[PDB]
Write a protein that binds this ligand. Sequence first.
Ligand code: NI
Ligand code: NI
Ligand code: NI
Ligand code: NI
Ligand code: NI
Ligand code: NI
Lengths: 101, 100, 100, 566, 566, 566
Amino acid sequence: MIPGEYHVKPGQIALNTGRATCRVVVENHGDRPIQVGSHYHFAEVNPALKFDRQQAAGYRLNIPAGTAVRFEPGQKREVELVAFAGHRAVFGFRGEVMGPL
Amino acid sequence: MELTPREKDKLLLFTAALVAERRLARGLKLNYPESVALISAFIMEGARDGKSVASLMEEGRHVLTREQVMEGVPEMIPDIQVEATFPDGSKLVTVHNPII
Amino acid sequence: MELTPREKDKLLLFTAALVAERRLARGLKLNYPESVALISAFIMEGARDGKSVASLMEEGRHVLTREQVMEGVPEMIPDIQVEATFPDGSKLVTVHNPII
Amino acid sequence: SNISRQAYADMFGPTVGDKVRLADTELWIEVEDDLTTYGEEVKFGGGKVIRDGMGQGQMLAADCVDLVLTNALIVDHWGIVKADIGVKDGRIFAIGKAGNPDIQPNVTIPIGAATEVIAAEGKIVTAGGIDTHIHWICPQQAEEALVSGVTTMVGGGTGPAAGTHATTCTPGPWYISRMLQAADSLPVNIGLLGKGNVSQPDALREQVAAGVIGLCIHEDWGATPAAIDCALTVADEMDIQVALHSDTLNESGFVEDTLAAIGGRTIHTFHTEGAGGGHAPDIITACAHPNILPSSTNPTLPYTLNTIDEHLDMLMVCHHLDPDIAEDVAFAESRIRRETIAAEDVLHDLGAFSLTSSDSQAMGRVGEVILRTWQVAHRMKVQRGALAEETGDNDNFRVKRYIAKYTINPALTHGIAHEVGSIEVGKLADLVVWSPAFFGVKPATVIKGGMIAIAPMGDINASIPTPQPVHYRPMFGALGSARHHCRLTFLSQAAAANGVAERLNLRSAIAVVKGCRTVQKADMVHNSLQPNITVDAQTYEVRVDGELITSEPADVLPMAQRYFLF
Amino acid sequence: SNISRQAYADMFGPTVGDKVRLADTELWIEVEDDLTTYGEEVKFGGGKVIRDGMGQGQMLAADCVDLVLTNALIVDHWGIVKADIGVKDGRIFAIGKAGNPDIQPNVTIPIGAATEVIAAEGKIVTAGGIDTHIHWICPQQAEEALVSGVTTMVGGGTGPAAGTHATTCTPGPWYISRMLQAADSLPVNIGLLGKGNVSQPDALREQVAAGVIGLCIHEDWGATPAAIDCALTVADEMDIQVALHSDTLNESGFVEDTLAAIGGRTIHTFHTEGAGGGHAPDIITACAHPNILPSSTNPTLPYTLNTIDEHLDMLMVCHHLDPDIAEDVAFAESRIRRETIAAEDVLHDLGAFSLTSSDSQAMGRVGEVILRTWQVAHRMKVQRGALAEETGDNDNFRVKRYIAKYTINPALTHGIAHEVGSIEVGKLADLVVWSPAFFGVKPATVIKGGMIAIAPMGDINASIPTPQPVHYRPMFGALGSARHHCRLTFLSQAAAANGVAERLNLRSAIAVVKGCRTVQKADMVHNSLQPNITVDAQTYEVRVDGELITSEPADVLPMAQRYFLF
Amino acid sequence: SNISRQAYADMFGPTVGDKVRLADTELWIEVEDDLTTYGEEVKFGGGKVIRDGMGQGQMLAADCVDLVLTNALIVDHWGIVKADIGVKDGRIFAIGKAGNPDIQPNVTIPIGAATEVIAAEGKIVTAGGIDTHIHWICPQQAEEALVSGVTTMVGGGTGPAAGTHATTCTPGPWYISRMLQAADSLPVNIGLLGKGNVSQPDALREQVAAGVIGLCIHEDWGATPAAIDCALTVADEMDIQVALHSDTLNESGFVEDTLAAIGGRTIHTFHTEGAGGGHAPDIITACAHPNILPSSTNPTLPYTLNTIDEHLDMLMVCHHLDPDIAEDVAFAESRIRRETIAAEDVLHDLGAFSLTSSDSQAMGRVGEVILRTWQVAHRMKVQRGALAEETGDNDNFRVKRYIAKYTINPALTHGIAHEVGSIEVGKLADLVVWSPAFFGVKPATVIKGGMIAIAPMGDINASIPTPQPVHYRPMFGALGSARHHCRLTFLSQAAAANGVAERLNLRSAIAVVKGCRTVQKADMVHNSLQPNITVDAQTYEVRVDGELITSEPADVLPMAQRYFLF
Ligand code: NI
Ligand code: NI
Ligand code: NI
Ligand code: NI
Ligand code: NI
Ligand code: NI
């Protein structure tokens, strides 16, 4: 007996289903590490990350909400993006869009 | 003495620990509050003696064993934290999974 | 620990009982508050051990005798009451004429 | 991407189909629904979702909630569902999907710069309890009750005085005014009951006009047919509730005469089992009538090994009875009966008894109304198994039936259900957050009117709120004017119209009671059974449809020795 | 029918002719009268008298009292009688026979639906003490004093500051205003004293117009003939009291010069014995004059084995004296004299000293004014026997003489006797209920303005208010606006007329002092002796009519080790 | 006559040329000036100077101070001098020579009947500390901070909620209003910070109009260039301060990008060393710019033996980080760096870091801001010796530089320096009196707005305030309306003009912040160094002008085990 214990049923959860996604190769060209969040507009991440910014337009990382992806200096890896929804209006970040799209 | 609010608060932890200490001596299996109180006071005295944070983080896991506390209690305490005045000022001691 | 107001209040009864306990040990005849505090803490520990209400109502009358308390004290205490968490929850223990 | 169910539960709390044990009981709840869009959950923290342009929008205050309880597992009379809770203006704004509409789908609860966050993932959220049987013997009961999860207190008294010790009555205009003022200092919602034992209607109307939300008829002040009829007559015209503690001595008649005087009019019978007061030994039969809203006081919940031994002396002290006076002790065995004590537990399980209360410091424990309701549910599952209404392999229905006993049912019975009682939009945000290991015993957070009023807090000078010693301390919701803004003083409609709040210069929010004469047994959520119950005048045996009703005394219970220091 | 006297006493408390021991002293009181009609006593409880149509009537609120203290044994300067006490609008309504005129005879105190009940049978009821020598060194003294049974506090101070540590003075308009506001938070009646040491009348008038009810002349601020005369001149025109702590150093003259400056005008001399301050060593001779209202501070009451040893260091700390400075220590033996310390006890017994006070945290104990007055009475009975005024085999007269020392006499001296000081109709209901075993030591209930302010209370979550631990906790009468409504802030007539209460926005009830210039030694109830007392300049011996006055030091006292934990 | 210097110091405290050790540290202060006229010092007591016609004059209230702190040794950013302090209307009236102009020479601070006295001879007087990094996790922090000597608290929060646990933000109008009201109950000066992470200016303006005196940008809510720029734009137009806790993850850019978004506009960078948050690992380089007002949080002050071990787990709890999630733990070693931790101590000693704060219950200790600032000063003197600015054989300059870190510099940075921050005429009388043996650790008296708010107090029923147990208890300055009159609620100019105080019905005094956009590094008293500092991206080494900056970890510190019970 364990007070307040969970009895989670076995299986898996499919995240962000029914949404456009794309893979992108990203390379950290900075001298310090960089870490990106799940809902951050990818096309506006730290300028030291080299990748096709044009493709990541309106996308965010296809990872469980709240988690993050790290890039050590000089690191290169392929990440999967998922398209923003709702009104698809970006406000904030580095302020490159500040409106719909 | 000029006892500040925090020094008086700790007198509460100390007194709670006296209750647990006597009960364990009678040979009872300790409950949730009794456990936390007992291990927490252990650590405070550790700092008073001048033991380092690192030493106590380890010793804190050998105060009570799974066979000395009630069922479910070890899982009810994922870690224990208490601050005390060490020779080099106030420091935080975190003991992860104290009861095994 | 998550100590509620009532658990903290009992830490008062416990500490009051430590004072009486030491005094009786020196061989002093206990006074009014010292007596109540000492017998009251006896009962609480009784419940912690898991003794029944009925057993304690009896044992409570054999903690202190008329020759261990100050004059007039036994008549100043027609009964003693304290509640504690027994295995089957909170219960009230009433000890009538505890000192004889 | 994809995530395993276990990792998912550790991160955002359990989802549909997962089960959770309640504290250390045998009760298991199973999530019935989840209102989230998988992958779009909101989480607060460094690099998490609730950050500008992401899970936080650009809308102004008016367009977003003030508080969001993220990933909460709600347990209410209406469901056991996973959702985010939105709070605006101290009231429940919505139960849905929190986030930013600019980038997330299905957001029904907007998060903006003005939104504070309470991370409820892995916690169980419930409405605040409502104790309708308070003896105002001391102000210290409010803190005690609040720490246990009871956010509303109805009762009567003036302090430690013989009248109050014995009865829930705030006698007359002066004491009512005085208690109404003193109430602004207490961190819980309050409503007062006046003394209703009078055969002169005007003496009652005054008290109602003075501010009381009900009248308590107590045998210590004379629960005669004349008095009962008089109180119910005024209640009918002023829209207030009557709480009854009948004639135990059968001095003016038996239970059936009391039932006759009531005349099928709405009334809330206190401690219907009888141990706390009422016609000996069959006051329990009242639970069979459509106009009676029956409740129990907690000392008899649940039937255990020490219950009887304890009760013999608890009786005397309360009602100023003399252990030497034969007559004052003779009715002890007629008052405390093992047969009715055991039957009561079952009658709750069946829905025949609809409420639970304390009977604070007069045969009941103020901080144990929630704790004992669950100990009963546990014991009944253990002895009788699944209820006929259960579906699936969980105790979900039994949990809704028992949680309604100290939340919504008490709210309906006293005419305050329009303001509190459950987690429904528009209601005052009186919420309690619990860690599953401490459900029903010690809360993680207690929210009043939209602000945290009390919570466990560690070392004040510590670098984090978690180091020891950890104990309940008052928070901002319990301070000065913030408290006034987060609590309600319930008035009667007459008192409200007479300007009693302006004249007494009350600083708290005001709420008016209504619909006390129209509620009936059939309205009590999940607890509307009107059983054909009989009680044997001699053997004291309780029978429902001829079948014997009874249960066995527990030697050990959960939510007891594992959680308390004393 | 018929009932034996013993059973009668157990049921309704003692009656005419019965005697009761006060705590563990040698003092015995005997009931002088009983106002009840045998068989028609009112008792509260199940099946008792105070029930609808029986001991409770049908009258409206306006026609019945708010509170009734049933079967109380009153001890007051005017009698030791058995009666019921009626309370209405926070004031003493009547002392008579409570009940229902419809069915009972001689009912002078009506009980209705609006009447709360306090069962006082077997208890002793007294008025609240009044301490006229408070040093406001900390707010914590009010709770301490209240628990002991002192409901009114007069004194001065601003907090723990050198000026206040040494003197009872609230210096100037700003500090007075600040302390008047802070007072609303305290659960006792308060009146402030300003600094009266100034030879410029306008500097005093301001303080009086600012709100003080008196002026304290203290040697630490300069108790010169000029200052004394100036303060008494303003007092005469503003109707305020002057409290004096004379020139111990004889710097400006001896005691006879101080007496000369006073000029036969009304004045209250603080600690007239001298140990607490005043002309060394004969300030005690002042008790012989018609215009001097003399009082004692409690550390010297009564003369005991450890009194002298203790006092030597207690002196220094208080008045910031230096133990190394010869001059600061030389006047120690001139200040503390065994001869005057022993004589003081006798002078109280004779009625030459009319008041008792504490001198809180500056050579006196705030929670021991009542306790020590009785310890003196005990010791004096033990050593000198019956007073010449006694009648019958009881200590009744000695009890009235000593109880008046901390109740009515302090009330007359400061011009507040019209509001408090004794149990008389129209006075504020500041009452203290005691169990005979704890009389003078620990109260059963302490009532302020008609509401219980503090009382011993047991476990809050207990099923009854009696389980342990039992200790004093604040009740409703001590909360927010209810407290404001049950306490008085005494103002000077000028302050009242200037609208000081409206300008400072004081929330409590206001009372004005009056008749401070017209009281004299002959007005002090039971304590009006003006003895021909002399003091030997060298030997320090005190003589009254040439006969030597003295008493022996006690090794053990009652109301001590049997009641306290520390 | 003549008196030896030693006897003189024992009597009136040290004078010019005398040195005094601070607690048990190696720091020694030397009196630089004395404002008295030898032989004309004022002393309170029996036969002392402050008596009518002597050291006390005949002037009316308007012509004399309300309070005088006699013979005080002031330690302030401007000097370490001996003088009397005059207090009038809750404000500092003068720093000079107290007495009576009628008979004494050079009296600049008049003493009259309305003057209270605090004997400060032999004590050290300082202004009250100001903590600009408060997380309102609980109201209990105010008492804790007050007892340590901090009279002003700036920060944000709503209580124990995830948002507040992690950030100093009071989100939106409702929570701001609620916290503004709750603040009237707290005995310290308060100013709130709102959530500034929004790319929509109107959402910020509302919060400012609602009452906040600043906006906190926190990475947990998204510290992106857009958000930063938006907050600074509004700050520029509303005259409020912005407190920054940058992007530790370098998610939107490195430190130089944050610096770019700021655009040379005024900003206060929180915990500039980095351990508490900010761009890893070089957020420390910000202390080199003219527009950055840098401060440190106390857990890293000073570098000691257990600092690193402790910090690893302290990180997680605060910002709701998961020890299992690789990403949430990976940035632990990037956050906590021994190299920057040691360098910070030196950077303070040089004046490159201008403030010290706590970061209460989110990686910092509320009652240790003063204590730790001095422990650093001690350690730096021990390791680096005399500063280049020292003159004479004392640590005077190092003491002024370090005392300014928690007094005046925090006051300038947040625009409240016109009301508090130092001991200068016209400023609120927020003073702290210390015994030299307990300097920086436990105060003798803590004065708020002219009244003692908290002080160590002994047995309440004792004959003097000194018997044990002695512990801090609330005084009159902390009670009801007196408290309201002695504390300030800081509002923004917009909030003040909108009538927010009248609408929320705030009872305390109001003060408006101004000059937050015009302060710069060069304005920070004694701490204006803009060093050419670099940080090695890999080795994390800190270099100033190419030279390596570092210090050694202490194994033992003063103001620790000798003063505390736990
Ligand atoms: Ni009842
Ligand atoms: Ni009841
Ligand atoms: Ni005096
Ligand atoms: Ni005095
Ligand atoms: Ni931060
Ligand atoms: Ni912080």
